[PDB]
């Protein structure tokens, strides 16, 4: 039937051109039936699932009919809005219909090509209207169906579609840009769309360069500031490279002149990211982004030294980066008058010259020859005296490492061969990327046999039973002995090697094809390590360093001059710390299992769990585990957080109270060192662990010792938590403020009662004492301002401030003298130099004005300052001014005469045409949101004339502006007591605009109107 109707359309067209009849309604009548046919075959196909061949033949036949009927109609003219709704239903139902192809190419791509070409020959005004409305549905369909990429890349064969649909696509992606980095498959698919849209602008240089010119700062900027605190920021850096290959090398004209004002803040960011120790391939990505910039040699001299550190890194092992590094260096050598180049290369001359010298030995004819040519281009700068000599290899000590006694059958002679390097080689093999499992087994055998043969084998079934059954194990009190690594002198050459063997055993126990043959072996050794440890530091058989009165001195460890009588069982904890501080997070599972095994063994052969907590070994465990949170790397800090979490949830609460201060300090340092680029989602975990620690420790209960310990820990913890109230760092300051709220929420006490005994810390800190607000950096100024705001926000007021008593006049007038200078020309100060925004600095002082409202003797100055902020030009500054106005709204009263005298200018410029801009409308709707009695019906009547003038301008200038007319109607929603007689005239002109523009699907004049309409 569709086959017959495929060729029957031309007959209708031929008969319709003979005489002027009625054929428009007939053609659209079957189209609705065809649209309904899509729904029938798409809604019931989920429950229904030859069938597949018939279904695809029906879809292909009907789609060709849809293309054919559109071909006869269009072959432009403007389309009526009613059938655009039908097309909205058509496209919505078509995506659900395109599902049979999934269960079962060449014809699949062909049929999608015909479907994608239906909208190519349609009116562009209606083309963008339908696709903008149904852009989120299409993205969601791609999230479920992966075959729409064939349709996606067919939008650029040679249509005019890509020149218009891409504008909507990029706007939708920018709206949900922060969503990237949370999920996995959603971020990758969004990145794929970014690659395809960047391919279109790169392939078609016409009418795509102008589209990319605006809203380009957000793509470059917001990607950088959102990858700092995210889980997988690897997708953000994958997006910037694609933009670089499109803004340069191809479309270049108005894009080059737009990327220039972003190089200062972008090039100085990539320099800091490449100096970290994040990962192995991540650093290679950073040096690729910093180099190969889409900027020519000009307009780069002032920023030349910032491209030298990445050049050194690119010439240090990577196959592709060395080739690119030589090309970048060769380009500079070409035309730069190398005496100028020698001046800018001096700081990194030693590193670059050594890198070039070492790149002449690799087995490659495309690198050594290029490097030799580059070196020959230098006159004599490649052999000048280096101020830093080459590093040498030296041996610190003169001792003998581990050896294996192997005897021969000749002359009765034994041989001792060292295997120090063999263990290191085995560790490298286990850490390698592409090695066969056969050599992994051999490497594991070397570690296993060396570890077994090193320890002794004695006391078979006789001495072990007597020692474990001996008395004074569950009766005698364990002496308080503290074990610390702070007294360690130097690592012996054998301790490091034995540490490496243990780490290899732990790593070999998690890799698949070796796990079942290593878990019992590793677990049994850990049990052996613990039992020999507890037999040495116990009561009845204590060593002389384990007396009641003892010292943590060097004799505790294995050293040269002061040893522990040979290989004390303390290296197991060191191996646990190293494996938990590995770049791969697959060792955390075995790390916590080993810790659980260690406690399980100790809790059995000691009688009770609380007595095992007093054993001196756990004192060294926390110090070793908390030392991993001080390294500059981020994965090491994560290992410490996991160790903190495991020891908190498992071992009982009485232990935690004693070491709560130590855990809090370790969990607090992580959020302070991580400021510029934080992590792959580590501080979020740290905040959760801190929140869990506070709820567990502050939970009310029942012996006298537990209560005394709980309040003793409470006094020590709360003292530290008031220390960062005025901290210059915002992350710790906000966490500390949130720390106090949750602490009072858990317990049955208020907030100020907690901070009663610790007032002496904050007496001379939160106010300025012996200091000024102009001699300190803005980082401390904001922290002090927020401290005063938090100090005077609770309904119980602490540190009451009154002006003319003591020192409260200098501080008060200083913050009044801050909300006057707006432009940066009048604030040319040495302290206020590196402030690109200067907006957040005024916000903290503004909140202080609204924080204090209990002093009625002086309110004219603060009221004028508050209204001055509301009358500002910036958008973010005005929004915060509204926020503090709402905060100040809870005062005594606001007189009308104050409002009339403060909004005089707004009425002065009311009677003008070039004055009702977006900023003024935002100001006008903000001031009418509160105090809902400021205008009358005459003002509403005047505004009706204004909107008529606005709507008359658009219909002329059409054949930015859409938002202002949507906002001006939205202002009528906020204002109460609007006349009832104005409803009819406003809806009449709206229809007139909707009739001239012929738009009906979700107009911007509809969403605020429907809320405006339902009042009466």
């Amino acid at each position: 039937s569709c086959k017959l109707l495929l060729n029957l359309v031309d007959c209708i067209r031929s008969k319709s051109e003979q005489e002027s009849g009625n054929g428009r309604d007939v053609l659209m009548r079957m189209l609705e039936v065809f649209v309904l046919k899509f729904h029938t075959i798409a809604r019931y196909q989920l429950s229904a699932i030859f069938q597949v061949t018939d279904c695809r033949s029906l879809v292909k036949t009907l789609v060709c009919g849809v293309k054919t009927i559109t071909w006869g109609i269009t072959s432009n003219k403007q389309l009526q809005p009613k059938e655009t709704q039908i097309y909205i239903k058509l496209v919505k139902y078509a995506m659900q219909a395109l599902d049979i192809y999934q269960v079962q190419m060449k014809e699949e791509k062909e049929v999608l090509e015909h479907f994608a070409g239906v909208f190519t020959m349609m009116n562009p005004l209606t083309f963008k209207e339908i696709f903008q409305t149904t852009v989120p549905y299409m993205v969601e369909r791609i999230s479920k169906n992966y075959a729409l990429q064939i349709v996606a890349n067919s939008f650029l064969a040679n249509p005019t579609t890509s020149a218009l649909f891409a504008t909507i696509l990029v706007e939708y992606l920018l709206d949900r840009l922060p969503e990237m980095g949370s999920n996995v498959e959603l971020s990758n698919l969004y990145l794929k769309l970014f690659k395809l849209v960047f391919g279109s602008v790169s392939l078609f240089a016409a009418e795509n360069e102008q589209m990319l010119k605006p809203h380009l700062h957000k793509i470059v900027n917001s990607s950088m500031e959102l990858a700092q605190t995210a889980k997988e920021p690897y997708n953000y850096f994958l997006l910037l490279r694609a933009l670089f290959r499109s803004i340069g090398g191809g479309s270049h004209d108005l894009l080059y002149q737009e990327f220039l004002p972003l190089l200062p803040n972008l090039l100085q960011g990539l320099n800091m990211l490449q100096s970290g120790l994040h990962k192995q391939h991540m650093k290679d990505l950073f040096v690729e982004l910093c180099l190969t910039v889409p900027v020519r040699l000009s307009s780069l001299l002032p920023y030349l030294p910032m491209l030298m550190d990445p050049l050194v890194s690119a010439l240090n092992g990577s196959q592709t980066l060395v080739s690119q590094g030589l090309r970048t260096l060769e380009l500079c050598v070409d035309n730069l008058q190398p005496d100028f180049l020698y001046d800018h290369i001096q700081p990194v001359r030693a590193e670059l010259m050594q890198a070039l010298w070492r790149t002449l030995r690799n087995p490659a004819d495309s690198i050594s020859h290029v490097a030799y040519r580059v070196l020959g281009k230098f006159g004599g700068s490649n052999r000048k005296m280096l101020k830093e000599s080459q590093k040498l290899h030296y041996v610190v000590t003169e001792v003998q490492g581990p050896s294996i006694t192997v005897e021969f059958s000749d002359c009765k002679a034994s041989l001792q061969l060292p295997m120090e390097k063999a263990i290191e080689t085995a560790l490298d093999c286990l850490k390698s990327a592409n090695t066969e499992p056969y050599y992994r087994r051999q490497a594991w055998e070397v570690i296993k046999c060396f570890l077994v043969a090193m320890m002794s084998l004695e006391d078979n079934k006789h001495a072990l039973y007597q020692l474990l059954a001996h008395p004074n194990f569950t009766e005698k009190t364990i002496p308080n002995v503290i074990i610390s690594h702070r007294y360690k002198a130097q690592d012996t050459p054998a301790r490091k090697t034995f540490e490496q063997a243990l780490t290899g055993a732990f790593m070999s126990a998690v890799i698949k094809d070796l796990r079942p043959s290593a878990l019992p072996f590793v677990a049994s050794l850990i049990r052996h390590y613990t039992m020999v440890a507890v037999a040495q530091q116990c009561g009845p058989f204590l060593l002389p360093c384990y007396q009641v009165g003892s010292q943590p001195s060097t004799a505790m460890f294995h050293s040269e001059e002061n040893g522990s009588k040979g290989m004390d069982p303390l290296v197991l904890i060191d191996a646990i710390a190293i494996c938990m501080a590995y770049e791969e997070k697959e060792l955390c599972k075995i790390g916590e299992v080993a810790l659980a095994v260690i406690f399980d063994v100790a809790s059995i052969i000691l009688g009770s769990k609380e007595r095992a907590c007093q054993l001196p070994l756990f004192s060294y465990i926390v110090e070793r585990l908390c030392a991993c949170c001080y390294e500059q790397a981020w994965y090491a800090k994560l290992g410490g957080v996991v160790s903190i979490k495991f020891l908190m949830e498992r071992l009982p609460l009485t232990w935690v109270l004693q070491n709560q201060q130590t855990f809090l300090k370790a969990l607090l340092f992580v959020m302070m060192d991580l400021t510029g680029e934080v992590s792959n989602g580590a501080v979020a975990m740290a905040k959760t662990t801190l929140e869990q620690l506070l709820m567990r420790c502050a939970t009310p209960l029942r012996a006298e010792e537990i209560v005394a310990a709980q309040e003793k820990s409470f006094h020590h913890v709360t003292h530290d938590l008031v220390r960062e109230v005025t901290s210059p760092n915002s992350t710790v300051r906000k966490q500390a403020m949130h720390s106090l709220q949750v602490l009072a929420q858990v317990t049955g006490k208020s907030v100020t009662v907690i901070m009663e005994p610790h007032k002496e810390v904050l007496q001379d800190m939160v106010p300025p004492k012996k200091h000024l607000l102009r001699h300190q950096p803005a980082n401390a100024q904001i922290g002090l301002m927020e401290g005063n705001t938090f100090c005077t926000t609770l309904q119980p007021r602490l540190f009451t401030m009154d002006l003319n008593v003591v020192e409260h006049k200098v501080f008060y007038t200083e913050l009044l003298n801050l909300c006057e200078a707006e432009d940066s020309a009048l604030t040319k100060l040495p302290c206020y130099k590196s402030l690109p925004s200067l907006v957040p600095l005024r916000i903290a002082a503004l909140n202080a004005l609204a924080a204090c409202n209990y002093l009625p003797q002086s309110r004219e100055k603060i009221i004028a300052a508050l209204f001055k902020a509301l009358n500002s030009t910036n958008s973010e500054l005005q929004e915060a001014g509204e926020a503090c106005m709402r905060k100040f709204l809870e005062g005594a009263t606001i007189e009308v005469d104050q409002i009339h005298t403060h909004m005089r200018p707004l009425l002065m410029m009311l009677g003008d045409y070039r004055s009702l801009t977006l900023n003024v409308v935002n100001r006008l709707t903000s001031v009418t949101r509160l105090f809902p009695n400021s205008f009358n019906d005459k003002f509403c009547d005047q505004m009706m004339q204004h909107l008529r003038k606005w709507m008359e301008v658009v219909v002329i200038t059409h054949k930015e502006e859409m938002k202002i007319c949507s906002a001006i109607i939205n202002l009528f929603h906020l204002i109460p007591a609007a006349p009832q007689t104005l409803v009819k005239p406003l809806l009449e002109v709206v229809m007139k605009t909707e009739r001239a523009m012929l738009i009906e699907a979700g107009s911007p004049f509809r969403e605020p109107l429907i809320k405006f309409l339902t009042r009466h």
Binding site: P402, L457, V532, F541, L543, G566, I604, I605
Partner: protein
């Protein structure tokens, strides 16, 4: 290839459980498990 592995570096040897003596239910089942583990771990050669 038929002799146990010995080391002449007694300074790096990990001391046994009984070494503290010369320097002066679940428990029974745990002892048996360790004794069996040590029994099968003694048969390690240099081959």
């Amino acid at each position: 290839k038929s002799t146990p592995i010995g080391t002449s570096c007694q300074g790096a040897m990990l001391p046994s459980i009984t070494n503290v003596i010369n320097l002066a239910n679940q428990l029974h089942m745990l002892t048996n498990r360790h004794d069996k583990f040590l029994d099968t771990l003694r048969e390690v050669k240099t081959g």
